[PDB]
Scaffold this active site. Structure first.
Site, PDB file in Angstrom:
ATOM      1  N   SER A  61       0.761  -1.244   0.000  1.00  0.00           N
ATOM      2  CA  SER A  61       0.000   0.000   0.000  1.00  0.00           C
ATOM      3  C   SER A  61       0.798   1.305   0.000  1.00  0.00           C
ATOM      4  CB  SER A  61      -1.005  -0.019   1.126  1.00  0.00           C
ATOM      5  OG  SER A  61      -1.965  -0.998   0.760  1.00  0.00           O
ATOM      6  N   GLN A 117     -10.993  -4.783   0.281  1.00  0.00           N
ATOM      7  CA  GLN A 117     -10.543  -5.542  -0.895  1.00  0.00           C
ATOM      8  C   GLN A 117     -11.587  -5.737  -1.992  1.00  0.00           C
ATOM      9  OE1 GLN A 117      -7.397  -8.799  -0.091  1.00  0.00           O
ATOM     10  NE2 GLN A 117      -8.604  -8.869   1.829  1.00  0.00           N
ATOM     11  N   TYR A 147     -10.568   2.637   5.143  1.00  0.00           N
ATOM     12  CA  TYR A 147      -9.386   2.384   4.284  1.00  0.00           C
ATOM     13  C   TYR A 147      -9.739   1.272   3.296  1.00  0.00           C
ATOM     14  CZ  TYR A 147      -4.500   1.141   3.205  1.00  0.00           C
ATOM     15  OH  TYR A 147      -3.272   0.827   2.699  1.00  0.00           O
ATOM     16  N   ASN A 149      -8.903  -0.530  -0.821  1.00  0.00           N
ATOM     17  CA  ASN A 149      -8.236  -0.561  -2.133  1.00  0.00           C
ATOM     18  C   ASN A 149      -9.216  -0.239  -3.229  1.00  0.00           C
ATOM     19  OD1 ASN A 149      -5.914  -1.473  -0.885  1.00  0.00           O
ATOM     20  ND2 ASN A 149      -6.100  -3.590  -1.618  1.00  0.00           N
ATOM     21  N   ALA A 315       1.832  -3.323   3.021  1.00  0.00           N
ATOM     22  CA  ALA A 315       2.134  -4.732   3.192  1.00  0.00           C
ATOM     23  C   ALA A 315       1.535  -5.611   2.104  1.00  0.00           C
ATOM     24  CB  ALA A 315       1.632  -5.214   4.559  1.00  0.00           C
ATOM     25  N   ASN A 340       5.930  -9.648   6.306  1.00  0.00           N
ATOM     26  CA  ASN A 340       4.884  -8.755   6.809  1.00  0.00           C
ATOM     27  C   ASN A 340       4.934  -8.902   8.342  1.00  0.00           C
ATOM     28  OD1 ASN A 340       2.553  -7.215   7.220  1.00  0.00           O
ATOM     29  ND2 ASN A 340       1.160  -8.630   6.189  1.00  0.00           N
TER      30      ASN A 340
END
Ligand SMILES: *[B]([O])([O])C1=[C]C([N]S(=O)(=O)C2=[C]C(S(=O)(=O)C3=[C][C]=[C][C]=[C]3)=[C]S2)=[C][C]=[C]1
Length: 358
Positions: A61, A117, A147, A149, A315, A340
């Site tokens: 990210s 996601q 948050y 994607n 990550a 990670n």
């Protein structure tokens, strides 16, 4: 490197690699606008390839910062506006829930609950359309930050449409090249595979898997040298020759919303400096980083503030990265690892180092 930087870096990182069992790692400290490098362990255990300044790490990210700056640049060129409705660039998105959702909301995760996601099944272009047509927001636009994607990745995809260029071509031409990030890639070329470290997850060597909006949300791979250049560019945009890029960088660092003690920019997140360590350390834990939170609009947005701790964690299944910098202090750090490990451990190490240096 001054013995002082070498001293704090080694005294902080050494224990970190030991307690987190990190296979390999590269760190760059920018002190007074100059970069200093450090590397540890392996990029590939099996073939005993050590980490070096040329090793490519998956940014995860942290790729969102490049996407934010590329969008800022598009705005500065006058190709898009954050005030523009999402549909202006994707008319096919006709479902009514999209009505008051602007590029600003997508770029800042405030559209109303877009998911962290994109589902794995969503692969084709029409697949993506169906997904967003069917998405039912849990909140009205501009009220809650989650948050995601699927939020900023879509912002990235739409932002390059007026240019006529593909996301990766836009990113190459308008960001990487002008900044001389010549070993930073969305698709690593065959000739550079030898520098591509393996990520490690439970002892298994892994690389990030392709996915919808991956270039936009988590697809950049880069070296510790290119990342220190990225940090320098964001620490001092004024000294960037390309006008629209210098501006795009300032736009990505502007404060659009506030949640707790944090401010959402385009990709980058910021806090007022001096900062309270626990505020950034506890705030980086995913229990807080990924949680839905109410936001207060900053109307109009505050232009990039010199006195800020600007940062971003990143990550993939096999890598963990972190970038942080204080413009006012010409101070910054990049930490790239091929495992990670928990975000709090990353921010605390970065804090320990930067607080020591100034
Ligand atoms: B970003 O690094 O915050 C980010 C990126 C992605 N996509 S991805 O393919 O890089 C993946 C990252 C993971 S993970 O870091 O284990 C993870 C983080 C948060 C929630 C679940 C898993 C798996 S695939 C996704 C989310 C954030």
């Amino acid at each position: 490197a001054p013995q002082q930087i070498n001293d704090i870096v080694h005294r902080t990182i050494t224990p970190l690699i030991e307690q987190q069992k990190i296979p390999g790692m590269a760190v760059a400290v920018i002190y007074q606008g100059k970069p200093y490098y450090f590397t540890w362990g392996y990029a590939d255990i099996a073939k005993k390839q050590p980490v070096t300044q040329q090793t490519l790490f998956e940014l995860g990210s942290v790729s969102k910062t490049f996407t934010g700056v590329l969008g800022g640049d598009a705005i500065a060129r006058g190709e898009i506006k954050l005030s523009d409705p999402t549909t202006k660039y994707w008319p096919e998105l006709t479902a009514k829930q999209w009505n008051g959702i602007t590029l600003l909301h997508l770029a800042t995760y405030t559209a109303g609950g877009l998911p962290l996601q994109v589902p794995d099944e969503v692969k084709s272009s029409s697949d993506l359309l169906r997904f967003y047509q069917n998405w039912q927001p849990a909140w009205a636009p501009g009220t809650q930050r989650l948050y995601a994607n699927s939020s900023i990745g879509l912002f990235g995809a739409l932002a390059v449409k007026p240019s006529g260029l593909s996301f990766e071509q836009a990113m190459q031409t308008r960001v990487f090249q002008p900044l001389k990030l010549n070993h930073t890639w969305i698709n690593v070329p065959p000739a550079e595979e030898k520098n591509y470290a393996w990520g490690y997850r439970e002892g298994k060597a892994v690389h990030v898997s392709p996915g919808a909006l991956d270039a936009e949300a988590y697809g950049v791979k880069s070296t510790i040298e290119d990342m220190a250049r990225w940090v320098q560019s964001n620490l001092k945009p004024l000294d960037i020759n390309e006008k629209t890029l210098q501006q795009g960088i300032q736009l990505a660092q502007s404060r659009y919303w506030q949640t707790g003690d944090m401010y959402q920019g385009l990709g980058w997140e910021m806090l007022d400096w001096p900062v309270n360590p626990d505020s950034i350390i506890n705030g980086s834990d995913n229990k807080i980083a990924l949680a839905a939170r109410p936001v207060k609009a900053i109307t109009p947005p505050t232009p990039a503030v010199r006195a800020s701790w600007v940062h971003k964690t990143g990550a993939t299944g096999g890598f963990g990265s972190y970038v942080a910098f204080i413009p006012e202090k010409e101070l910054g750090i990049v930490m790239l690892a091929n495992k990670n490990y928990p975000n709090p451990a990353r921010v605390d190490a970065a804090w320990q180092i930067l607080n020591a240096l100034q």
